[PDB]
């Protein structure tokens, strides 16, 4: 919000150079003049014979402007032999990626071509250059001894780069190992030290690199993006990288340890071709000292409104937690074909509020696709998804869309002020723009009145207006303002006060000055520094008796204030800004002299009471809860009385009741901070006496883990009364947990069996199908469905195995569903390939681990009926009902407190056999 959008700096390279494709700050230790590094990957160069070799330019922000190209390399192509080129610098895109740390700056040519040392192959190895003291070295990590599509000849090393906090460069090349991709990291010191120009592949001690993997991982583009940050345990910066084509174009983000290439966590894209991984960023959004991962997926298509698909782009925000398991959230693009997550640049703390912040770019969004950058402030919770600022497009278009925001750099403060600044590159217009943060101001407004009360008989002060016995009071406002960073000393604010609120439209004005005879008043105030809260007093009087229509209403005195822009100072100019939310006005209120006695002052007796209906907690799955409340004041009128229901911090508020007509339809309010878990509802400033109110409040709640024993509500009324201004605290029991109805049921797919089967014969060694007969599947399913689960349970199946001397149903194979093991009796598998009541048992008991929150275990028993069995058996063909049965018992309810409920049930399945 405090980023100045009025007067940024605009830099430009030659036409067609894609000037702005890459940007970064340069912070040299020597000279006071800081610079900016702009990548111009297509720019024509002085390198002889090299066409569009590309370059990087350092740009001065302070005093004399424009830009000078950094000369890394003036050389053309070397020759392996006569008229036999060793390398190809033409269209090598030097400058596609530029990163700096302290005195060091790294720039890379990902399209850099290289002839083989033996064969004629010209391969896209990619190259980089590290400059530092004076000193320039060539760093060509992917240029190595194994060169081809299978090795790294296609790596295009330098496609993405980043420095670790320590001295070591992490570099991403997308093309290694059939575009599996590769990360390689090297100590910068090692690079400069061991570079020998007569050696085309230089041996580096302590270099870390991934290896070839199984061929499925081909074309996954590891190292498309890159970022550095500590995740595993502590210590060294560990490695983050986007692998956008991974998992059948689903995309992933791999994290490898900084010490070894062992990898710790993975993230994976939502749907294919969303290019999850296009951009990646690492920074601590919540200032919890745990780095948080951000992942751009600019091609994502969410679902809005009607349900129609739309590519908005999406950014992932993964908050690190000490447990090792992250806390991820999603952030969806606001416009179609914006490509929302295309660049994610941490800015650090732009407002110096104590939490780091970040800019996410949708370079193809906004009016005329001019490009937009959304800026989001960090908070204790995490990233605040409602963006505090949207930087819009500057340049419209020429040929390409400008892609404003296609590149960004932040967190490095380019000017003197204590706040970070941000560069966005728009290569489609060959431009780069520096946005500078303004210093932030937090003001603390004070207000106080001498007494609190209103009476015409309160007469005190005189007045030049007329003979005066009149009821006046003292009003004093005050401003203490401060902020970190450069604040130009003495800051002037124009404050304005109004004493009514229930007025000023016209008609009857309730409050007047004892000086300026006005409801309205201005004041040129001029505070300074961080201290010395500056105050100014004014005595204001009220209407007296007659001619006043008066009211019960307290008449709210409101004070507001604004900073002065035209009186402000800087080198060129920067107008400082107020705080984001530090409300720019305040309200107070007194009471009426009415009631209480003949005093205007009294002390009522406040009473609160409540009642439940049933109170059965769902164990935390979607449980509706309304409690009826009876609040009564047995004393006199309580001034500015309001209900404070203090509830457990995990629970949500549904709404006011508006159902039971004995309940209030009135004014309620949420408040989560000052560590308040309380809900606050307004009863009005002039509350009544002998009055009693009844209201219903519905909620919904989880109550995470093992806190189950009852539910506790605390509620209390509170007021501005001199004595007994608060009610006693009121408890409210709630009965903990509940039971559920779990049921088991089953079926046999051929529930019937018809007459004599064709092509049937019976012997005592008739292998498999013809003799065994047709397959009959019997699926049985036990399911826990309800707001409770079974931590342990017992299942007992009885299977009709044999009638008398013959095996009726022969079990071929058994199958399993869910967290359950089982064991049978009278073993099933034969030579390869009532009904059961009180009669020969084929019973199997099974032990299920848990059926949790609408979950179930299922046993599918497929059997064949044995012919032996199917012999006529004396009396001719009759109807048999083959019955199996399954019973259950639920074991170990969750909590000892409250009525743990016994659950019992059983099932039977039947197969009717007729001719």
């Amino acid at each position, epitope marked *: 919000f405090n980023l100045d959008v009025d007067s940024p700096a605009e830099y430009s390279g030659p036409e067609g150079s894609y000037f702005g494709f890459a940007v970064d700050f340069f912070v040299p230790s020597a000279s006071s003049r800081m610079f900016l590094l702009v990548g111009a990957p297509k720019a024509n160069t002085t390198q002889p014979g090299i066409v569009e070799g590309g370059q990087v330019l350092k740009c001065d922000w302070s005093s004399t402007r424009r830009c000078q190209p950094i000369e890394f390399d003036a050389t053309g192509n070397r020759d392996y032999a006569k008229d036999d080129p060793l390398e190809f610098k033409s269209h090598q895109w030097f400058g596609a990626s530029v990163r700096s740390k302290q005195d060091k700056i790294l720039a890379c040519a990902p399209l850099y071509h290289w002839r083989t040392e033996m064969k004629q192959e010209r391969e896209p190895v990619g190259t980089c250059f590290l400059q530092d003291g004076t000193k320039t070295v060539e760093y060509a990590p992917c240029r190595s001894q*194994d060169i081809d599509a299978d*090795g790294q000849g296609f790596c295009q090393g330098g496609f993405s780069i980043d420095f670790t906090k320590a001295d070591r460069v992490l570099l991403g090349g997308p093309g290694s190992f059939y575009w599996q991709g590769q990360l390689i990291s090297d100590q910068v010191a090692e690079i400069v030290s061991k570079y*020998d120009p007569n050696v085309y*592949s230089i*041996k580096y*001690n302590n270099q870390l*690199a991934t*290896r*070839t993997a199984q061929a499925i991982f081909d074309d996954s583009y590891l190292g498309y993006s890159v970022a550095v940050g500590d995740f595993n345990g502590d210590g060294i910066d560990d490695f983050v990288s986007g692998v956008p084509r991974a998992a059948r174009t689903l995309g992933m983000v791999y994290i490898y340890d900084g010490k070894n290439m062992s990898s710790l966590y993975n993230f994976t894209g939502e749907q294919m071709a969303a290019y999850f991984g296009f951009s990646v960023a690492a920074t601590d959004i919540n200032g919890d000292d745990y780095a948080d991962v951000f992942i751009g997926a600019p091609l994502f298509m969410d679902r809005g409104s009607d349900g129609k698909l739309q590519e908005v782009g999406q950014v992932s925000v993964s908050l690190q937690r000490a447990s090792g398991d992250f806390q991820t959230t999603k952030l969806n693009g606001f416009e179609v074909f914006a490509r929302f997550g295309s660049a994610i640049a941490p800015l650090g703390d732009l407002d110096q509020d104590g939490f780091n912040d970040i800019a996410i770019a949708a370079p193809y969004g906004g009016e005329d696709k001019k490009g937009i950058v959304y800026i989001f402030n960090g908070r204790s919770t995490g990233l605040n998804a409602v963006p505090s600022q949207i930087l819009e497009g500057q340049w419209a278009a020429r040929s390409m869309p400008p892609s404003f925001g296609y590149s960004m750099k932040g967190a490095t403060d380019i000017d003197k002020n204590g706040y970070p600044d941000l560069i966005v590159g728009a290569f489609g217009v060959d431009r780069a723009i520096l946005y500078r943060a303004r210093p932030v101001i937090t003001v603390n407004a004070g207000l106080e009145v001498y007494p609190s009360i209103l009476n015409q008989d309160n007469k005190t002060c005189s007045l030049p207006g007329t003979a005066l016995k009149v009821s006046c009071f003292n009003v004093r406002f005050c401003l203490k303002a401060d902020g970190k960073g450069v604040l130009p000393r003495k800051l002037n604010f124009q404050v304005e006060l109004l004493l009514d609120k229930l007025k000023q439209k016209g008609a009857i004005r309730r409050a007047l000055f004892l000086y300026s005879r006005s409801p309205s008043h201005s004041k040129n105030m001029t505070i300074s520094r961080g201290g010395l809260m500056q105050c100014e007093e004014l005595i204001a009087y009220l209407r007296d008796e007659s001619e006043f229509r008066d009211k019960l209403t307290p008449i709210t005195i409101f004070m507001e204030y604004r900073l002065d822009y035209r009186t402000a100072a800087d080198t060129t100019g920067l107008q400082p800004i107020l705080n984001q939310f530090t409300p720019a006005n305040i309200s107070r209120q007194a009471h009426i002299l009415l009631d209480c006695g003949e005093d205007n002052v009294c002390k009522p007796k406040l009473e609160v009471s409540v009642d439940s209906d049933q109170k059965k907690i769902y164990i935390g799955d979607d449980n509706p809860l309304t409690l009826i409340v009876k609040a009564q004041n047995q004393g006199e009128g309580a001034y500015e009385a309001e209900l404070i229901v203090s509830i457990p911090l995990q629970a949500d508020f549904i709404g006011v009741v508006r159902n039971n007509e004995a309940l209030a339809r009135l004014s309620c309010a949420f408040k989560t901070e000052n560590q308040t878990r309380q809900v606050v509802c307004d009863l009005g400033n002039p509350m009544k006496a002998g009055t009693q109110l009844l209201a219903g409040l519905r909620f919904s709640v989880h109550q995470q883990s093992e806190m189950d024993t009852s539910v506790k509500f605390d509620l209390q009324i509170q007021s501005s009364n001199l004595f007994d201004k608060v009610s006693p605290v009121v408890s409210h029991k709630v009965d903990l947990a509940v039971l559920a109805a779990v049921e088991i049921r089953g079926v046999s797919s051929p529930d019937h069996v018809f007459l004599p089967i064709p092509n049937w014969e019976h012997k005592e060694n008739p292998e498999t199908e013809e003799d065994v007969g047709p397959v009959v599947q019997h699926i049985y399913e036990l399911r826990n469905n309800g707001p409770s689960s079974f931590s342990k349970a017992m299942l007992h199946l009885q299977w009709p195995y044999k009638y008398n001397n013959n095996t009726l149903l022969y079990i071929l194979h058994y199958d399993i569903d869910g967290p359950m093991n089982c064991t049978s009796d009278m073993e099933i598998n034969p030579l390869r390939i009532l009904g059961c009541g009180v009669a020969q048992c084929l019973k199997i008991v099974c032990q299920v681990g848990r059926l949790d929150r609408g979950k179930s275990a299922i046993l599918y028993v497929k059997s064949l009926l044995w012919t032996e069995t199917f012999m006529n058996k004396e009396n001719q063909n009759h109807s048999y009902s083959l019955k199996s049965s399954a019973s259950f018992n639920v074991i170990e309810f969750p909590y000892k407190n409250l009525p743990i409920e016994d659950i019992t049930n059983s099932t039977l399945v039947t197969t009717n056999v007729t001719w």
Partner: antibody, heavy 118, light 108 residues
Framework: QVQLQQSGAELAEPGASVKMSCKAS????????MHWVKQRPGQGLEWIGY????????ECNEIFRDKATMTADTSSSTAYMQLSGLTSEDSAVYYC???????????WGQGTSVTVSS | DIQMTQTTSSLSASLGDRVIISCRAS??????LSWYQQKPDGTVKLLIF???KLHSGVPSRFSGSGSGTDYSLTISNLDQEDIATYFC?????????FGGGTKVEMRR
């Protein structure tokens, strides 16, 4: 700080197949070519062939063809040259060599003295 | 393959002398020639590559002279650790062809 740690002396009866080891410490092994050189006692240097780790591709010398069996363990950064059916003219100090650019093997091993006798 | 001939196999010299080690290729190898110093205990360190280049820690005393066939390792002022057996090796084409080596003999 590059060290090529070889196997110790290897005495083996004629016909047998010894297999020497070469540990590559101090640079990235799988990215560099591995040459082997044979020095017979009081004799000159006979190049045996090279092996590229990773890909595993190995081009031997034709005078040593069907003698030198070159393998490479990229998970331990260790080259291996097996010698099948070793005769007494295979008595020699064998040298693994890290291959630099151009025409030159940079940073060598200590040597393995294989001796075929009865 | 092209044979590498060093015609002088034992060069006697004092400390400080100028030692020009000649080595001729059979066929023109277009200047890929490595010079290796094998100390008497047998460890072989690389001194020069591509007809003249110093490799890292090798001192400036080893002048790389050569072109075409005729090549020559020109040792500057001699010292004790410079007493060893110097091989040339043709690296241009395949299979790599070494020389006979030239033993630097301290003079008494």
């Amino acid at each position: 700080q590059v060290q090529l740690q070889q196997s110790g002396a290897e005495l083996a009866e004629p016909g047998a197949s010894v297999k020497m080891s070469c540990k590559a410490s101090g640079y990235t092994f799988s990215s560099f070519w591995m040459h082997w050189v044979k020095q017979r006692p009081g004799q000159g240097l006979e190049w045996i062939g090279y092996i590229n780790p990773r890909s595993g591709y190995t081009e031997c010398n034709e005078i040593f063809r069907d003698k030198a069996t070159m393998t490479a363990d990229t998970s331990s950064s260790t080259a291996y040259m097996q010698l099948s059916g070793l005769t007494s003219e295979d008595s020699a100090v064998y040298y693994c060599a890290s291959f630099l650019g151009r025409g030159a093997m940079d940073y060598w091993g200590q040597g393995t003295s294989v001796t075929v006798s009865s | 393959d092209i044979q590498m001939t060093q015609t002088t196999s034992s060069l006697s010299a004092s400390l400080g002398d100028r030692v020009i080690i000649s080595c001729r290729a059979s066929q023109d190898i277009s200047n890929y020639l490595s010079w290796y110093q094998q100390k008497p205990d047998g460890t072989v360190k690389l001194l020069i590559f591509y007809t003249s280049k110093l490799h890292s820690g090798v001192p400036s005393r080893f002048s790389g002279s050569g072109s075409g066939t005729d090549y020559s390792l020109t040792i500057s002022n001699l010292d004790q650790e410079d007493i060893a057996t110097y091989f040339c090796q043709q690296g241009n084409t395949f299979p790599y062809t070494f020389g006979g080596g030239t033993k630097v003999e301290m003079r008494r």
